[PDB]
Every structure is written in C-alpha cells, then in structure tokens.
Design a protein around this nucleic acid. Structure first.
Ligand SMILES: [Cl-]
Ligand SMILES: [Cl-]
Lengths: 87, 31, 118, 118, 90, 28, 29, 117, 87
DNA sequence: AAATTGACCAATCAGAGGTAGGATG
DNA sequence: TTCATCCTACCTCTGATTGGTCAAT
C-alpha cells in the first residue's frame, strides 16, 4: 500500500475537479491514484539521484523543483517556486 | 500502441523507474 | 515555452478553461498568507511513497508540502482533461478510458505509459 | 564541557526548553530537604535489574536511590526529545519512531544501539 | 526470570508528565522507553561493577555509580546527582 | 545503519554488554 | 395512539414509575 | 400459562425460534456449574440503577446477579423480536422503529410505553 | 449516569442476538439501553414497595422473582427460580 | 503495578438511497 | 428517430464499525 497515496483524498480532489452532477467510476479513482503516486515516485527518483551524486543525504524543496524542470514539468516547477520562497 | 521514442526529458527516468519498479515486485512476491 | 504544458494537446473551449485553471492556480500560489498545513496522515503517506525508493535517505519537511500542492494541481488538471472525453461520449460517469484518452494528448504524461496501457 | 549533553543535537526552541528542564532538575537536587523513602516495589525492581548482572555482588542502599532519581531525568529528557519529532510530523501521539529519531541526535544514546535498532 | 526491566506503569507515568497534558503515548513507545531506561541502569551498573571487582571490593556504592556515569559520557547526570548524593550522607 | 566508530567513552562497555546480554539469553 | 387500559399486572406500577421518574427529573434539575 | 410471554404476538418461524431460544436459556440455567462472578463494574452499575429509587435501602448480593442474567435474556429476546421487522423491510441495520414495532406485539412490554412512545 | 446500564455491554448482547453480518443504529442501541434500564427500575420498584409494606430493609432474590411474577414476567421468574436455588 | 473493560476519538468501511444507463413499445 | 417508464447496476455519502489509548477499578 505504501506505493500509493490514499484513495479517499484522491477522490475528493477529482470530485472538486468535476461538475456537481458528475459521477466517478471506482476504476477511474484507482487509475488516478496510481497516476499521482507514480508522479511522486517519478520526480522523487530524479531528485534522489542528483542528491546521491552531490553527496547530500537530504532531498529538499529545490531538488524537487529542479527535478520537475529536468523531467519536463516546467509549469509545475515555476508555479511551485513562488509557493516555496514564502516557506 | 508502444512507441520507440517518448518525451526526451523523461525517457531515461522512465527506463530507471521500470527497473526500480521490478525490484519492488521482487521483494513483495518474496515477502 | 515554460507554460506550453498548460494547454498542450487541447482544442477550443478546453484550451481556455485549462489556461484559466492555471491562471487560478498561479494567483493562488502568489497570495501572501499560506498555511502550509498538511493532515498528519497525508504527510506520513507522501513520505512513505518517496521512501519506497531505496536511493532516498532523508527528506526535508518542505518536500512533502510541495508534493501535497503539486498533487492537487496534477489530479485537478488530469480529471478536467479526462472529463472532456466523458462530455464527448455524452456520459455523466468518468471512466478509466477517459483518463487513458487524456494522457495520449500530451507528451508531459509519457511517464505513465506503464501505469495506463493505451 | 560538563553540560554538553543537555543541548547535544537540539536546535531552536527545543534547546532552551531542555536547558530550562535541566536548570529545574538541578534547582531540585540542590534543595536542602530531600525525602529518600521511595516505594518498596520500585527499589526491589531497581536492585533486581542491577543483580541480573552476575558480576554484581552486594549493592549499597545509596546506588538504587541515585538510579531512581537518574531514571526520572533520563525518561523525562528522552520523552521531551522524542516529542519534538511527534510535533514535526503534526502528531499528538508519541510513537516508537519518535524515540528512535531522538536517540540518533546525540552520541550519549550510542549505548542503546542494540535496544533500538535504527 | 525477566527481572531485566523496571515496571512499565512507573515508566509510562514519568513519560506522561514529560508531555503536554493532552498528548498520548503509543503502547510500543512505553515498551521502548522501558527497555531504554533498563539498559541505562544495566550499562552504568556493569561499568561500576567491573571497577569494584578490579579494586577487590564487594559493595557497589554511590560514588561508583557517579564515577561510572562520568566514565561513560553521562557527565551532566554525574554532576547533577553529585549534589544529591552529598545531602544523602550529612 | 551500523557505524564502525560509536561514542569513544561507551564503545568498550557496549561490546561487554553484548557479551553479558547473550549469556543472560543463554539461560533460556 | 394512547390506550386507556394496558397490561392489568403492570398499570399500577407504570403510574408509580411515572411519578418516581418525574421527581428524579425535577430533583436532577 | 407460564410461557405465554415466550411467543406472544409472534407468528410463523419467529415463534419456533423464540421458543427454541427460551429452551436454550432454560437448559443453561438448569446447568450445574455456574460462574457467579460477572464483572464487578457491571454489578456495581446494576446496583446504582436499583439505588436511584429512593424507596430502595439495602440490596442482597443475590438481586444484581438475577438482573445480570435477566437483562441478558431481555436484550437478546427483544433484539431477536426487533430483527423480524428489519428482515421484513429487507434491511441489515436494526433501527429504533424495529424496537418500537416489536414492543407493540406483546403487552409484557406495556411498562415501556413512556420509554418508547 | 446511575439510571442506565453502560451502553457497550448492551450493544455486545444485541450484536450476539443478530446475524453475524447485521448492523445496529446508534439510536437502536440507546433505545435498548433505556428499555433494559427501566426493566431493572420497574421490577425493583415493585419489589421495593412490597419490602416497605412488610417493614423489611433488604430486597433479596425471592423479592425480585415475586415482583417479576406479579408484573407479568412469569417466564422470567420461573427460569431464574432454577438459577437462584443453585446460588 | 498489572489486567480488564467502558468511553472516546479519528479513521475506515458498508449499506441504504440515489442516479445513470439500458430495455421496451 | 424521440420520448415514457420500467428495471438493473453502480456510485454516493451518511453513519456504523474498527483500532488503539485514556481513565476508572
Ligand atoms: Cl497552502
Ligand atoms: Cl452463570
């Protein structure tokens, strides 16, 4: 289970994404769960390799933003940079 | 269905995640 | 170029709405008063996904917080991209095939080719 | 120097709180009217822990009284050190992993390497 | 036997007092703390014990515990309890 | 995970408690 | 809804319990 | 006569089942090896219900022990009577209206008309 | 409060009376608690008045049974009679 | 001091009701 | 084709169960 984000939180965000009338198939929720969980694992694997090769043990915010840029999530990296500078 | 070239920024990390994913399955079925 | 992914693959009304949704996200992150509040159980679950990778040793407190927010945007965008195919088929119920269809429109999602075969 | 262990591995507010705890412990031990009459069952059990070692033969009445006081300080400072990790993870329940995390911040706790594998 | 551990109710009471009034403690946290403080006793006593055998003495005393505490890097514990031990004898 | 060098004041007493702990566990 | 005659073995004890329950409630308050 | 209350107001299989439940209760009470130390907390609390009545002064140890057994039978038989009404509405969750419906089938339950109006 | 048996014990007896897969509404548990508590208070009050009228201070097993018989719980009296004689 | 059990909180799961999507004419 | 109205099957979301710690005994 530790591979996947919990499904209830995923289903809540999807419901807010959709019009009031909309239903979501159980299959659709499970799929979205696997997708967002790979999104984390994917970016984190990139960030983690760069840390190991620069002899740092701590994966920090800049490592996640740098990895998003590398992997072609530039819109995510720039939008979230603003969020991180306030932290 | 399955293409030869994918997103050039993502292709290598994809190959590595295929390996990292295989090794998670090796342990889960073992234990 | 760095906003290319916002509407890559979308046509007509869908382009405007996803663009507007991204303007909404950016306005939100630009606001001055952020909680940075994560539920204990979500925070422990994000760390656990990251930690499943043996190469990951120690995780900063700010990393799960970035992912909390990024995963909200990822789910919403993809759900909204998926819903287009549900409307096209004049359906009220979003199915797995609507997500599959949404993934195929942008190369940003190539990382998911093994998670959703299509 | 002598008090290096009070603060070893702590940052920010935790550092002042453990130092203030130790100043409170010292004020208490410096008071002129101690009661050295601690419960028959607790001192029977302290002596039994000491006596579990074959190398120990006879135990002074003083030794168990030093340990009764020393163990209260040990438990308190380690629980307070472990609570920091409970707060960092937005939790109000202390877990075993909060104790493990606290042991790793100071080499004073190296003697517990086999009691709490980490 | 299993006389290796302090009784857990006393350990959990001291822990409860170390935490904010509305904090909770997991059973496994109490058990962990119980083993930690019992090795604290065993570890120090073993050092105090060896020195006693090497100086041909039978009784382990208060000075021996404090000396073992400074030897093992528990200097703050030895210095604070020194004050306490003096008062015990006067 | 398992370090070569631990606290210099504690190392030797740790080694000795590992022996004493196995022997106590030998009774059972 | 509300009957005049109930179990002939219980009626008198029901009336008394109504009195005893009213007291408790007025002594409670 | 003496067992009229066992199946009063029940028809069909419910009747046989409540009857068989009472037979099972009676064989149990007829057994030779009773353990008469039910939890001191439950017997303390039974006694506090009895002592809420100002008229009550001293209570025999015998009395709370009779009510412990009696209250187990009462809850069991009323729950079983109430389940009938949940089964008829094709429900798996017992509701208050199932207890109310059950009470209305037997005048043994007339003492509860103010408790369940 | 003193008027009511603790609800956990009541809920446990109810759960054992129902099929293994049955649910119990909170309101159903609370109703059964009030019912069984009045069952005690009702029988006790009849036993308690007979005691007062006959100038006795203690209420005993045979008074509970006599009160159950007079109040129309005859099955409960006759079943528990057998139990009382073993005690 | 240790074991047992009721109460309670937060997190999860199940079923009772609600809506979709298909069948028929 | 476009309705009218069933039925069946799935999803929703309230509310019941679960898991685990405190408090009382
Ligand atoms: Cl925020
Ligand atoms: Cl019994």
């Amino acid at each position: 289970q530790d591979r996947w984000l919990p499904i209830a939180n995923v289903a809540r965000i999807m419901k807010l994404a959709l019009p009031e009338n909309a239903k979501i198939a159980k299959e659709a929720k499970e799929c979205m769960q696997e997708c967002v969980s790979e999104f984390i694992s994917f970016i984190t694997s990139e960030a983690s390799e760069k840390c190991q090769q620069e002899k740092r043990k701590t994966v920090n915010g800049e490592d996640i933003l740098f990895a998003m840029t590398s992997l072609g999530f530039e819109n995510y990296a720039e939008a979230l940079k603003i969020y991180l500078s306030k932290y | 269905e399955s293409p030869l070239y994918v997103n050039a920024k993502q292709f290598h990390r994809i190959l590595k995640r295929r390996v990292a994913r295989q090794k998670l399955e090796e342990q889960l079925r073992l234990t | 170029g760095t906003w290319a992914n916002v509407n890559q693959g979308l046509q007509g009304t869908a382009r405007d709405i996803l663009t507007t949704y991204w303007q909404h996200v950016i306005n939100h992150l630009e606001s001055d008063n952020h909680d940075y509040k994560i539920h204990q159980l979500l925070l422990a679950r994000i760390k656990k996904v990251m930690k499943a990778d043996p190469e990951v040793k120690m995780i900063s407190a700010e990393a799960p917080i970035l992912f909390a927010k990024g995963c909200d945007v990822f789910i919403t965008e993809l759900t909204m991209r998926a819903w287009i195919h549900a409307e096209d088929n004049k359906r009220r119920t979003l199915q797995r095939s609507d997500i599959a269809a949404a993934l195929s429109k942008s190369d940003m999602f190539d990382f998911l080719i093994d998670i959703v075969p299509r």
